[PDB]
């Protein structure tokens, strides 16, 4: 049976010569939980996977697995399961079973097959694999072991979009049902945002961020966690702080007694507001402000409407639900939901809020 | 100056020994349209770019550029440009300029970098290329030539997904200025939507529907269309008609005297609604149908909260607009919208509706 072990990076850092590809990462992931790294490409998510595999030394720090220290010891003791990327179904799972009776080998493929629903494929091969999915198999071989650990580095990257959402479904549920602490590595958001209990954002060797899907994306705590989730990207306009207000290139928006800006008036900040939490006049928001504009382009994409909408001299997107093809040239009233609008500090990017 | 030119393709086929690429297509491409080829891999659309291009002939068939039959005409003689994937950007853009006076080629380089607002850009380099794009670079030197018709081959496939939106609108603007006659070709259902006037849905050789992203996306003649734009893609469930209901595995839908289906009472057909035709009680339509249901799975994107919520034996995908991180187990009310629904016949696969 599978434990809930708990994992813990301390000061972990990672550098390449001269490239720091791991800065100092401190991270308690919890016993049983599905934790994310999301991020970039290079951003350290990957290194850190296979530092915690073993696959990799760190260059400073400490991993624990529970209470033991497993930072050098070897990846086959450390108790995990990698998932990455003639023999039958049966053989494939069974592999990975390393001195085992051939009794408990059974006993083991029998209930990985069960779990994975692909017991009816288990005398089929490969090739032959059609009743069911060969990304199935994989995933059964992987926690066939009973791992302590799952680890699993852009498993989904070469599946077309439909079995893709499929497999993160198939993924997640499988892992509430374990309750095996999962360490999942994406650079896909939106995947992200499906399978993490918990998402830890990346950029450049450091944490920038972690939290649940909720706390990512209503409270990001600076501007590149707050424009990495979310497709479009959230409307990101450098503004100055007044009396009570913003103003940025050709525009105003007035701020209710927020202003959490007051170290700001008279300063210079970022403001930031999601298409999806902006609206168009004749199509509810407790507070709100408006802003007449132009529309300079839409994507009517029948499921969504996304319309480039000229603020001043500023260009933003708006999101409608459905089909709305608005004809470019047209004038309409922005209307902002300014219980979601964000702010934050020009030079840090962190944010005020 | 550029010219508005109509180009037939009649019974236009194309066969590599066995296999048949093109099927016997007939298309009317209007003058000045921006027309978008849309299907998967080696549906027969990028052998039709070609056939166009006359980089390939046809096995039958005839292609028309105004009234002028240029099957058998070399790429050159047809007046076109094909955009597709040290020199300084006046001198890329230059380059296609094929024994040309030095005064019309500064000319015409200055119109096209003009045309895509890279005139700052003319005496710098590729590499150095920082201060605009080297994507707008390629598309002014496919203009310059002034071509009769433009064509386009997935050029965006290989860009980041705020970059690849940026595009999409910068070469429709520019082709709605120019009224250039343009056959683009694509995958991507999403970038299709966004940039033609009209969509060809493509399939194994064959056209199997012409039309505005609107018709379709809300008028979908088959299954195949149906499911390839939109997505998450629209729900298709196995249905038997009655009285004047439907009926599926588990449940049944109150059909309003729709019903033209009486060619089926007592027949399977195969019924179609989109997530975002659907919604949740608590959350207008003007006739609709009502189905309990649990939910089995939730993606709580931020900007959207898809739900896979089990329909009597079926599974179905809801779209709901915003963050509602709903709970896997929880019954909902789901809320069809009647007027959104689509009837398929099951064998040809054939709109009924």
Same mark, same amino acid.
């Given at each position: ?19 720091? #590809? ?34 990799? *030394?760190?260059?400073?720090?400490? %991993? &624990? ?6 930072? &050098? /010891? ?29 009794? $408990? ?14 017991? $009816? ?24 072991? $009973? ?15 439909? /079995? ?9 549920? /499988? ?8 360490? &999942? ?5 939106? $995947? #992200? ?21 909720? *706390?990512? &994306? ?54 930031? %507001? ?56 047209? *004038? ?22």
């Amino acid at each position: 049976v599978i434990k809930m072990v708990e994992v813990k990076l301390e000061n972990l850092t990672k550098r390449f010569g001269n490239f720091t #590809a791991v800065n100092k990462l401190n991270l308690t992931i919890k016993d049983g939980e599905f934790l994310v790294l999301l991020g970039p490409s290079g951003c350290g998510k990957t290194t850190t996977l296979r530092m915690i595999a073993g696959l990799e *030394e760190p260059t400073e720090g400490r %991993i &624990y697995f529970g209470d033991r220290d497993v930072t &050098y /010891l070897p990846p086959k003791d450390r108790n995990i399961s990698m998932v990455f990327q003639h023999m039958t179904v049966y053989e494939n799972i069974a592999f990975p079973l390393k001195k085992f009776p051939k009794d $408990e080998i059974d006993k083991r493929v029998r209930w990985a097959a069960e779990l994975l629903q692909i017991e $009816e494929l288990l005398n089929r091969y490969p090739a032959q694999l059609s009743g069911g999915q060969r990304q199935r198999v994989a995933v059964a071989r992987a926690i066939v072991v $009973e791992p302590d650990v799952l680890l699993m580095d852009e498993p989904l990257s070469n599946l077309d979009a439909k /079995l893709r959402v499929a497999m993160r479904a198939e993924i997640k549920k /499988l892992q509430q049902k374990l309750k095996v602490t999962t360490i &999942y590595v994406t650079h896909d958001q939106v $995947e #992200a945002m499906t399978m993490g209990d918990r998402i830890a954002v990346m950029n450049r060797g450091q944490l920038l961020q972690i939290g649940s899907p909720t *706390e990512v &994306y209503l409270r990001p705590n600076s501007v590149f966690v707050a424009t990495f989730i979310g497709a479009p990207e959230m409307n990101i306009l450098e503004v100055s702080v007044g009396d009570g207000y913003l103003e940025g290139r050709g525009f105003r928006i007035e701020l209710p007694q927020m202003d959490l800006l007051k170290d700001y008036v008279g300063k210079t900040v970022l403001f930031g %507001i999601r298409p999806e939490h902006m609206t168009v006049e004749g199509v509810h928001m407790k507070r709100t402000a408006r802003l007449i504009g132009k529309v300079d382009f839409v994507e009517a994409l029948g499921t969504d409407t996304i319309l480039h909408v000229k603020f001043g001299d500023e260009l933003v997107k708006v999101k409608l639900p459905g089909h709305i093809p608005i004809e470019p040239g047209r *004038e309409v009233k922005v209307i902002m939901d300014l219980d979601m609008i964000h702010v934050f500090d020009k030079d840090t990017e962190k944010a005020i809020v």
